[PDB]
CSV table of C-alpha atoms and ligand atoms in Angstrom, one decimal:
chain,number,residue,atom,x,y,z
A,1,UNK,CA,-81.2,85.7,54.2
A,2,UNK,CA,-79.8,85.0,50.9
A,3,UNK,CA,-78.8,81.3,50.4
A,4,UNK,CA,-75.5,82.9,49.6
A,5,UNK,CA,-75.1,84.3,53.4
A,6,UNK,CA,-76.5,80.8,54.4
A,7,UNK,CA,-74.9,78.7,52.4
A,8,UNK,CA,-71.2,80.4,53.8
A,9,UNK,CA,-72.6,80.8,57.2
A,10,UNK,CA,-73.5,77.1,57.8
A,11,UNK,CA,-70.6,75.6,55.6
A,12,UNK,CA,-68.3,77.6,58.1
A,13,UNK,CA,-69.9,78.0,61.4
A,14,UNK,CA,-71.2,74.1,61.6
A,15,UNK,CA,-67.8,72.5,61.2
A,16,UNK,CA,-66.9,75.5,64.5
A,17,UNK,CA,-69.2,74.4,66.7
A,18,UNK,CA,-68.0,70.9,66.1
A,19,UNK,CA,-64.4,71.1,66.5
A,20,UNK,CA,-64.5,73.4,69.3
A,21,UNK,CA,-67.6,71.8,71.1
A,22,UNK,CA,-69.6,75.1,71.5
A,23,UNK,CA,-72.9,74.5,73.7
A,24,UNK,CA,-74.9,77.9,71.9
A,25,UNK,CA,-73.4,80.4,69.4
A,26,UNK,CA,-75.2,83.5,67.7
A,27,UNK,CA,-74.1,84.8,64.8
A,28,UNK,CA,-75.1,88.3,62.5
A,29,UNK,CA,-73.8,89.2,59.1
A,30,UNK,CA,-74.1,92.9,58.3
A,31,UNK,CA,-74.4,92.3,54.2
A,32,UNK,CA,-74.7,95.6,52.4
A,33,UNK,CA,-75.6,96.9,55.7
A,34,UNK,CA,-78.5,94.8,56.8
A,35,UNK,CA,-78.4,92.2,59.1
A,36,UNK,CA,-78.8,88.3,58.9
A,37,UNK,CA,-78.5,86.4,61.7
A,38,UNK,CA,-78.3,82.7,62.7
A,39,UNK,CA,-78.6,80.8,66.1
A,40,UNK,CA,-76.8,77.7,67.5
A,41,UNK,CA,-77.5,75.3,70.4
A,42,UNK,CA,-78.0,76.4,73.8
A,43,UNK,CA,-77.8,79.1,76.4
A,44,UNK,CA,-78.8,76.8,79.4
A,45,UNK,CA,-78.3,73.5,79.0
A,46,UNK,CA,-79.7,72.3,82.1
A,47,UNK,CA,-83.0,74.0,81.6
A,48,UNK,CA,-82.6,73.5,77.9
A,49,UNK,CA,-83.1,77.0,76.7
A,50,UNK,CA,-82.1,77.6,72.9
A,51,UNK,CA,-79.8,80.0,71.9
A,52,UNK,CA,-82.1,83.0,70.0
A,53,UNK,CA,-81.7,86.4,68.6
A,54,UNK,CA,-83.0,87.6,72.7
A,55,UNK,CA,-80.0,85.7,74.1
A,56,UNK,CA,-77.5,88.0,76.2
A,57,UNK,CA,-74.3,86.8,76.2
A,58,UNK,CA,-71.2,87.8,77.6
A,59,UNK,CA,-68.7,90.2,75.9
A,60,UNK,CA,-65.9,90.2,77.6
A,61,UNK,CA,-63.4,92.5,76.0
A,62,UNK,CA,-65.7,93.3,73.7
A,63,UNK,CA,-66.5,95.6,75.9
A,64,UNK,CA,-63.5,97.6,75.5
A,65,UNK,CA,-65.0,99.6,72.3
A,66,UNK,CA,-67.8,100.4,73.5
A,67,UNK,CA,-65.4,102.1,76.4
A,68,UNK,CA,-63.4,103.6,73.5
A,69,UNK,CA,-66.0,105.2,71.6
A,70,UNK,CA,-67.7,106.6,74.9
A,71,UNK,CA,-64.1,108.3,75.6
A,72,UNK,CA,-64.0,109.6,72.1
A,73,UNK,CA,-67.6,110.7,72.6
A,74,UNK,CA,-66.2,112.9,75.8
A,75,UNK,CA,-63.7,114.2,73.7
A,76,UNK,CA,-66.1,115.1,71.0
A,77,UNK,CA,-68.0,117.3,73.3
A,78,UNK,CA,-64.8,118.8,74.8
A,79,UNK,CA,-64.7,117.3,78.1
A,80,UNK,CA,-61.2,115.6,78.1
A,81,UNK,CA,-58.2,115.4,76.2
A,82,UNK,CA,-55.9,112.3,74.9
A,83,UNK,CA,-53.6,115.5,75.3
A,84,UNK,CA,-53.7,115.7,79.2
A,85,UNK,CA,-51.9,114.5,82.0
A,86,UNK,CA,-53.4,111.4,83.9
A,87,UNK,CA,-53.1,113.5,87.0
A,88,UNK,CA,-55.3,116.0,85.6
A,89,UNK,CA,-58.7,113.6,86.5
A,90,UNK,CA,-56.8,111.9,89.7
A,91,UNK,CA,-54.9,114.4,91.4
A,92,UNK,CA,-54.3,111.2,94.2
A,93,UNK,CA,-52.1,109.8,91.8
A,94,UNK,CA,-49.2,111.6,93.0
A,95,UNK,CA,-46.3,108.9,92.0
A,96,UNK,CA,-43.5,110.3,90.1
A,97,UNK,CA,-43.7,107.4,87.3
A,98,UNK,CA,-46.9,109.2,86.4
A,99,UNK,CA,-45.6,112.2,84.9
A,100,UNK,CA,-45.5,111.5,81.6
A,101,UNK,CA,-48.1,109.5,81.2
A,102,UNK,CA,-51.5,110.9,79.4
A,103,UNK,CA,-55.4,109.6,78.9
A,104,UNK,CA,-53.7,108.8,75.2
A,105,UNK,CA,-51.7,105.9,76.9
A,106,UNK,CA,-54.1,104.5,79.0
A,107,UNK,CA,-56.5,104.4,76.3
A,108,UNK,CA,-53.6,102.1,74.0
A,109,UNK,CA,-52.3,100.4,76.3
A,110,UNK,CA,-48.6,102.4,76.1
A,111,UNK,CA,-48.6,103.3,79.4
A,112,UNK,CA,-45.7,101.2,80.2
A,113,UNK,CA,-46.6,97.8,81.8
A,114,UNK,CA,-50.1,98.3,83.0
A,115,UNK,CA,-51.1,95.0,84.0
A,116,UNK,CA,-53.5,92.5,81.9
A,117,UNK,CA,-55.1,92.0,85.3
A,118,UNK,CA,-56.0,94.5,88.2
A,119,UNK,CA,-55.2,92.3,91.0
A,120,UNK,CA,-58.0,90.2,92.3
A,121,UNK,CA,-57.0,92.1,96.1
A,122,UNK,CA,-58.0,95.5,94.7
A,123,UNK,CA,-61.3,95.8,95.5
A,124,UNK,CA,-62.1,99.4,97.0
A,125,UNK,CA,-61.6,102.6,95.6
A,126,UNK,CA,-58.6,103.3,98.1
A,127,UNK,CA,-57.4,100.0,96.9
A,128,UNK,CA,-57.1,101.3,93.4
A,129,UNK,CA,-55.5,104.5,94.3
A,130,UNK,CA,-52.7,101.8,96.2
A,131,UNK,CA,-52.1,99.5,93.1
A,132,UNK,CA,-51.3,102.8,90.4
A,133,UNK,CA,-49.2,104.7,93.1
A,134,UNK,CA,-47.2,101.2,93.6
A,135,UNK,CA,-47.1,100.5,90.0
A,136,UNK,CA,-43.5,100.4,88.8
A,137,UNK,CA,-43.0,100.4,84.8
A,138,UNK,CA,-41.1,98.6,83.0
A,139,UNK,CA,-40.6,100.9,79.9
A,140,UNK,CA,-41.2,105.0,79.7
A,141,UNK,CA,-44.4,106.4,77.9
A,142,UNK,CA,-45.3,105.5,74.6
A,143,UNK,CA,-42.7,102.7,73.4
A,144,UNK,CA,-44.6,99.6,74.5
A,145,UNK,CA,-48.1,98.7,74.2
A,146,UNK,CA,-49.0,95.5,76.6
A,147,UNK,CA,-53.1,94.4,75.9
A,148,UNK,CA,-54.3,95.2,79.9
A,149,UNK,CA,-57.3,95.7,81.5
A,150,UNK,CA,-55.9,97.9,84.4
A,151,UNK,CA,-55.1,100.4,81.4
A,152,UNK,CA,-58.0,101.0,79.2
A,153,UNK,CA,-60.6,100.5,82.1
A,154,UNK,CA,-58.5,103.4,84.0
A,155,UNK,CA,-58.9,105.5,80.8
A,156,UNK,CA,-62.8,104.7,80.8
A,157,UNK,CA,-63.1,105.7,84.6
A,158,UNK,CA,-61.1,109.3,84.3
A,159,UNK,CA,-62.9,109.9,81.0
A,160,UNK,CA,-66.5,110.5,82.5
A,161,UNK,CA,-65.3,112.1,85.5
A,162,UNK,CA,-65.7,115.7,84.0
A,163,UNK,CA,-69.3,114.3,82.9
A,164,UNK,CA,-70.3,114.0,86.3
A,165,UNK,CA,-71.9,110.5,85.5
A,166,UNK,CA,-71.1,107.2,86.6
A,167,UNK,CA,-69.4,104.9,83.8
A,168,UNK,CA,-72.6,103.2,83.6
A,169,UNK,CA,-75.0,106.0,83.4
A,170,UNK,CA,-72.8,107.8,80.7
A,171,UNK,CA,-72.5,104.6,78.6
A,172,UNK,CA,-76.5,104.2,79.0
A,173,UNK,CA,-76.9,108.0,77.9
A,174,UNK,CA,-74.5,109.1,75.6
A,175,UNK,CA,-73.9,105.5,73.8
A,176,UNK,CA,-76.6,103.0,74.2
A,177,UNK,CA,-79.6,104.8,74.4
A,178,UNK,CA,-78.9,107.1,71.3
A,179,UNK,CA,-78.4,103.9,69.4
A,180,UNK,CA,-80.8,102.0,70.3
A,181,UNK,CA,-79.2,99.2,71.9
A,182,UNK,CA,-82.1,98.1,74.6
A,183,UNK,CA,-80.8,94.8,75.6
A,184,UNK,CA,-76.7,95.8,76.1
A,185,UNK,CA,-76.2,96.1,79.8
A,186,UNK,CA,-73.4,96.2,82.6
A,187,UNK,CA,-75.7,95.1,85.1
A,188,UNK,CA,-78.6,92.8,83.6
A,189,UNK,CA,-81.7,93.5,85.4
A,190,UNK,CA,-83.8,91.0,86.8
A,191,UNK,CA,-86.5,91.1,84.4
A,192,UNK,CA,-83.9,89.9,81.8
A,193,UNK,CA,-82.2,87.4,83.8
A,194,UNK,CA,-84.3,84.9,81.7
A,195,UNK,CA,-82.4,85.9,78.5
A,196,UNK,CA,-78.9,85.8,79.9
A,197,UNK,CA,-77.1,82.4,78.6
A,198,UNK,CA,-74.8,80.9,81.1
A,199,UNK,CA,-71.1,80.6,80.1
A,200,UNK,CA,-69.4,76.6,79.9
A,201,UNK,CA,-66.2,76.5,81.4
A,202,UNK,CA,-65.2,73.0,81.5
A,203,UNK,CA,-68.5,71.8,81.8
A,204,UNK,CA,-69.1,74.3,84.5
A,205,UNK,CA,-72.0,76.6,83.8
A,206,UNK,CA,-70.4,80.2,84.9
A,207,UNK,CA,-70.8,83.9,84.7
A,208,UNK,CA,-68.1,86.5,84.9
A,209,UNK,CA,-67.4,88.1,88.2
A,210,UNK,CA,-67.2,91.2,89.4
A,211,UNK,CA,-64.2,93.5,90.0
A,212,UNK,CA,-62.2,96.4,89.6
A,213,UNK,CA,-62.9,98.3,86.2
A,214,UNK,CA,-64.6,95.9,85.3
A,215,UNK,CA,-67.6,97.9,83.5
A,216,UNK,CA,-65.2,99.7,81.4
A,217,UNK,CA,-63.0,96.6,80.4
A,218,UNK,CA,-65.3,93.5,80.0
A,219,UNK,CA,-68.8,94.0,81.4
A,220,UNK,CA,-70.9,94.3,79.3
A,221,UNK,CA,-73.5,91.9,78.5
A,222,UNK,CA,-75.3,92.1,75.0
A,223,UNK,CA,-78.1,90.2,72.5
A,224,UNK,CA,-77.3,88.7,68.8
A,225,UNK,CA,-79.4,92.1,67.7
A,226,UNK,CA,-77.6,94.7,69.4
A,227,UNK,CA,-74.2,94.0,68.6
A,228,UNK,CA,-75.6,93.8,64.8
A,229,UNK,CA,-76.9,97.1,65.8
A,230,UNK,CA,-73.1,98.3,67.3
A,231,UNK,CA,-71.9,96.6,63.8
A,232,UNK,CA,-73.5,99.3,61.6
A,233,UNK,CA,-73.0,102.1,63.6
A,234,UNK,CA,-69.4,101.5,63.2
A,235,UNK,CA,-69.7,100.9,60.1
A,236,UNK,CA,-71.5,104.2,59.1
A,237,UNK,CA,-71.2,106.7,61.8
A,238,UNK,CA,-71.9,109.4,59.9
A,239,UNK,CA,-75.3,108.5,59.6
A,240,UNK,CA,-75.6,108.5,63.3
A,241,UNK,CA,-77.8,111.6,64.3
A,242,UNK,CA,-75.9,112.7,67.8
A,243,UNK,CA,-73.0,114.7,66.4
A,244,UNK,CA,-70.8,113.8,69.0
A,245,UNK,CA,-71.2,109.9,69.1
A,246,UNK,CA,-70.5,110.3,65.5
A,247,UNK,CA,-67.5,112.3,66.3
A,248,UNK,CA,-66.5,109.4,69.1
A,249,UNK,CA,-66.7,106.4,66.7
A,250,UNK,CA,-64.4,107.9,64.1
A,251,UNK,CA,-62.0,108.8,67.2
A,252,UNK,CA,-62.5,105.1,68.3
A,253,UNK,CA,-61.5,104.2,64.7
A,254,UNK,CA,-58.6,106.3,64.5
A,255,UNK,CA,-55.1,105.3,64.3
A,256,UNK,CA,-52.4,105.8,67.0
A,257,UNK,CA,-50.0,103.3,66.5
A,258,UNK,CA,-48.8,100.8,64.8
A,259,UNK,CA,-47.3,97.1,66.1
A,260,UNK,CA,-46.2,94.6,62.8
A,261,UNK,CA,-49.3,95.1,60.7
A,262,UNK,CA,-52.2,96.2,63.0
A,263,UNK,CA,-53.4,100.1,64.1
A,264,UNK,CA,-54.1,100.3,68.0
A,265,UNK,CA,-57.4,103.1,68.2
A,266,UNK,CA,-60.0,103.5,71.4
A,267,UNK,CA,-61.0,99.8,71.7
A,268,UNK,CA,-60.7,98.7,68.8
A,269,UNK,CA,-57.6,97.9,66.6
A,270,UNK,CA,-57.5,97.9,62.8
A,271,UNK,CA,-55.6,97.2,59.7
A,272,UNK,CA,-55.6,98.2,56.2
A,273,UNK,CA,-57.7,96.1,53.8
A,274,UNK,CA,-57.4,94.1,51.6
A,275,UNK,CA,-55.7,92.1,54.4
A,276,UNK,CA,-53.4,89.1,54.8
A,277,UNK,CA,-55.6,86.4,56.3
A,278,UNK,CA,-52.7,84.5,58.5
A,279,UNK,CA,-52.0,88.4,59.3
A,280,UNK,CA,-55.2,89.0,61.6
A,281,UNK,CA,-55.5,84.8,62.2
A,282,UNK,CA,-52.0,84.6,64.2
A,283,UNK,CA,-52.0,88.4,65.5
A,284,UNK,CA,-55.3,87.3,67.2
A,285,UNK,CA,-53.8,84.2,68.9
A,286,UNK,CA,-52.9,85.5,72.7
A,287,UNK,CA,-49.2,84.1,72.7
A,288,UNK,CA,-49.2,87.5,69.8
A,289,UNK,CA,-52.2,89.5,71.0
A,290,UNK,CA,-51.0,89.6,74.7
A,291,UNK,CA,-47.2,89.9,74.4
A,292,UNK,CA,-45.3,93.6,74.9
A,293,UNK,CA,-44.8,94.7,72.1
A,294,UNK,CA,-43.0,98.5,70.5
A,295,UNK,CA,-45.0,100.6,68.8
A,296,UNK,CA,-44.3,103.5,66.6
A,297,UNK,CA,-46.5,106.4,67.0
A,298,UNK,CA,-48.7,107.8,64.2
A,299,UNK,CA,-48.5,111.3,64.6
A,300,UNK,CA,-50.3,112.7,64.0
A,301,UNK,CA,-53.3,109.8,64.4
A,302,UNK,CA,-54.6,108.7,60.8
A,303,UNK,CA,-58.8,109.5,60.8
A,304,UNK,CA,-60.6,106.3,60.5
A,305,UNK,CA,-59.8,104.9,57.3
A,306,UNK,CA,-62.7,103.3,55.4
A,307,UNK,CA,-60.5,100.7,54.2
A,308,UNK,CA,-60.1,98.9,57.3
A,309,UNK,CA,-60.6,95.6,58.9
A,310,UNK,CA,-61.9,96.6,62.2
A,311,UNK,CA,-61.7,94.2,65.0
A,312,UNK,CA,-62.1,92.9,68.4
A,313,UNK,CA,-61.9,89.2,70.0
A,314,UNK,CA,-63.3,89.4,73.6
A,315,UNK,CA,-63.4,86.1,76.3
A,316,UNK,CA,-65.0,85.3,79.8
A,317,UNK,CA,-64.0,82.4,81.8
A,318,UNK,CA,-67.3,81.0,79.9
A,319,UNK,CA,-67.8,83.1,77.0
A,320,UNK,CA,-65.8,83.8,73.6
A,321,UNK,CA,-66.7,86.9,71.0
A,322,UNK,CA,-65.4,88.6,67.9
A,323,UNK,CA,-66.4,91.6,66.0
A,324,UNK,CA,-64.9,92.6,62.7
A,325,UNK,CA,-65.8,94.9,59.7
A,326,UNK,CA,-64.6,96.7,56.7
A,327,UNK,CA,-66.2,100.2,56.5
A,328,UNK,CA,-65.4,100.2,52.8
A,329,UNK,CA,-67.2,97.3,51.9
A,330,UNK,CA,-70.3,97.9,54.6
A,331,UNK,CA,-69.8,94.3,55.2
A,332,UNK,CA,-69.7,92.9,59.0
A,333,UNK,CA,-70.0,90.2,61.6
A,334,UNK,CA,-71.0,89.2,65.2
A,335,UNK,CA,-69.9,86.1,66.8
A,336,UNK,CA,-71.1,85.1,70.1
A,337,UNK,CA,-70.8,81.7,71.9
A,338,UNK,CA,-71.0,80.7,75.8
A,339,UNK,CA,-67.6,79.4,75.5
A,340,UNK,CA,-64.1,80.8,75.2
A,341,UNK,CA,-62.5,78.9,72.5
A,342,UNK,CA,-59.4,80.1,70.6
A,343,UNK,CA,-59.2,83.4,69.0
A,344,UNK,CA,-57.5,82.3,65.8
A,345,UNK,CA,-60.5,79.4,65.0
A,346,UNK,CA,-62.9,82.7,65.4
A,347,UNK,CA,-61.2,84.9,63.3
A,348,UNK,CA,-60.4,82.4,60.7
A,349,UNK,CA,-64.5,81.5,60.6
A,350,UNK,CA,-64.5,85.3,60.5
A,351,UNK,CA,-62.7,85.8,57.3
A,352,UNK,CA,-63.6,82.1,55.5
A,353,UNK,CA,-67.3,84.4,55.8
A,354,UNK,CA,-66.5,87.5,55.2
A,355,UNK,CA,-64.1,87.1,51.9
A,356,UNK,CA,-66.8,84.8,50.7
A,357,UNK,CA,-69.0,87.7,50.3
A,358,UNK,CA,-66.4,90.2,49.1
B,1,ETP,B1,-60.6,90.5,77.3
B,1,ETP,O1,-61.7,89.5,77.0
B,1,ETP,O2,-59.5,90.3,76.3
B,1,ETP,C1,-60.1,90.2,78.8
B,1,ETP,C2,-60.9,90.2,79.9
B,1,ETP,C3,-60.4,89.9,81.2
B,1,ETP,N1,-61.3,89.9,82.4
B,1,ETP,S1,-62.5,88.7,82.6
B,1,ETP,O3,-63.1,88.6,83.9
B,1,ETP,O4,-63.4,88.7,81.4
B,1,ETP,C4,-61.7,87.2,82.5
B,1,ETP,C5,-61.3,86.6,81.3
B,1,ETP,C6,-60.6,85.4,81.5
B,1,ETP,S2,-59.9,84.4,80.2
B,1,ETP,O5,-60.5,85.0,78.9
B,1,ETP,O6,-59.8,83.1,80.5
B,1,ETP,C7,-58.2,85.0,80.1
B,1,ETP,C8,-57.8,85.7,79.0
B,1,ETP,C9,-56.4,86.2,79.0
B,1,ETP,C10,-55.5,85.9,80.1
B,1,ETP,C11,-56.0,85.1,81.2
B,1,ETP,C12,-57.3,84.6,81.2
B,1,ETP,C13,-60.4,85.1,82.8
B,1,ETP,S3,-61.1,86.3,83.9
B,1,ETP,C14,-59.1,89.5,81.3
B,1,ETP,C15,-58.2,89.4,80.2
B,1,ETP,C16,-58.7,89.8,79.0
């Protein structure tokens, strides 16, 4: 790595790890597209394993683009619609306050007061049905888009039911696989156990749990080298070879609406660069990022604009993560750390980085 990388990496990252007491922390820089990465600390204190570029953290939300590009991937190949009804893919959901509400909305978030959380009760499949058919909202269709789980991880479930896959087999096949991401899972397998950090929660060495949607809106588990990987295929996704992956990250990237400065697309959410700094620092804080908030719709959706800051924060009870990149400049970065401290310290260490070098 150039001293350059290193010399902003360390002057930023060092002071992080202090302040916020973070036990391990990975970190890539996608310079010119090629990666640079750096390590931190530990992934098991107890048995005193160091953090390396093997480590699997936790993504938490994260998550949530690669669920957004795998949707835009099944649109690609014509297999679902933002277009159509909800009911379409779950004729169950027979509740009136359904009607107007499409796979567009669920993916965004403008449903109309999805929960952040599916309740911890909802457990089986029946259970799920239960929870949407009771679901009152609190605003119509497309006027309010509230951050929630119960919203975009719906959207990733109907989205590969045409597919015939499980979630998890159609994010393996159509998404990891053709990338090359060998060491991003939902479920790590035993044989990687070894490599998976544990999450520090007061202390408390922890690992998510399961639960509903949960694959498709914070599951999956990933190394220091993969999400570099996941970097520059967002970056350039033209030069990825399966036409419809290609197809399903510009989708991902595209804009739909628009809340104060940002761009809601599938998973991620953008804004157009150059950018204001306190702009993406305080929108990332959760008293901004959580809150209700209208939208206005793009219609039509704006095409992935290469001058973009695309981003993504993502947090476990133990782990904290945040992607960002500006297709324009092929300039990126990964930050992963086994503990969930403050968005707006990450995305501030984010952009002290990344407008260092350019
Ligand atoms: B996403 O990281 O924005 C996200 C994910 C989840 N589900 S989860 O099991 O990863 C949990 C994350 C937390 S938390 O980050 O402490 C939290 C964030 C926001 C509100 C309450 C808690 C606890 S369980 C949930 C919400 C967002």
């Amino acid at each position: 790595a150039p001293q350059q990388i290193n010399d902003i990496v360390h002057r930023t990252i060092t002071p992080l790890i202090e302040q916020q007491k973070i036990p391990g922390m990975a970190v890539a820089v996608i310079y010119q597209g090629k990666p640079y990465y750096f390590t931190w600390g530990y992934a098991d204190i107890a048995k005193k394993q160091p953090v390396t570029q093997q480590t699997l953290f936790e993504l938490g939300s994260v998550s949530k683009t690669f669920t957004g590009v795998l949707g835009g991937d099944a649109i690609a190949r014509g297999e679902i619609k933002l277009s159509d009804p909800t009911t379409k893919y779950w004729p169950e959901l027979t509740a009136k306050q359904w009607n107007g509400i499409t796979l567009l909305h669920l993916a965004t978030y403008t449903a109309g007061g999805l929960p952040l959380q599916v309740p911890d009760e909802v457990k089986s499949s029946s259970d799920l049905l239960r929870f949407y058919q009771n679901w009152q909202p609190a605003w119509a269709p497309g006027t309010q888009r509230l951050y929630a789980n119960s919203s975009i991880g719906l959207f990733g479930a109907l989205a590969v039911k045409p597919s015939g896959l499980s979630f998890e087999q159609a994010m393996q096949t159509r998404v990891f696989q053709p990338l090359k991401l060998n060491h991003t899972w939902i479920n790590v397998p035993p044989a990687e156990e070894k490599n998976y950090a544990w999450g520090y929660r007061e202390g408390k060495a922890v690992h998510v749990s399961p639960g509903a949607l949960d694959a498709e809106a914070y599951g999956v588990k990933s190394t220091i080298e993969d999400m570099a990987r996941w970097v520059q295929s967002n970056l350039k996704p033209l030069d990825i070879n399966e036409k419809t992956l290609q197809q399903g990250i510009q989708l991902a990237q595209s804009r739909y609406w628009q809340t104060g400065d940002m761009y809601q697309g599938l998973g991620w959410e953008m804004l157009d660069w150059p950018v204001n700094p306190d702009s993406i620092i305080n929108g990332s804080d959760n008293k901004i990022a959580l809150a209700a908030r209208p939208v206005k719709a793009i219609t039509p959706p704006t095409p992935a604009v290469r001058a973009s800051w695309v981003h993504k924060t993502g947090a476990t009870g133990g782990f904290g993560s945040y992607v960002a990149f500006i297709p324009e400049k092929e300039l990126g970065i990964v930050m992963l750390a086994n503990k969930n401290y403050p968005n707006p310290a990450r995305v501030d260490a984010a952009w002290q980085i990344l407008n260092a070098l350019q």
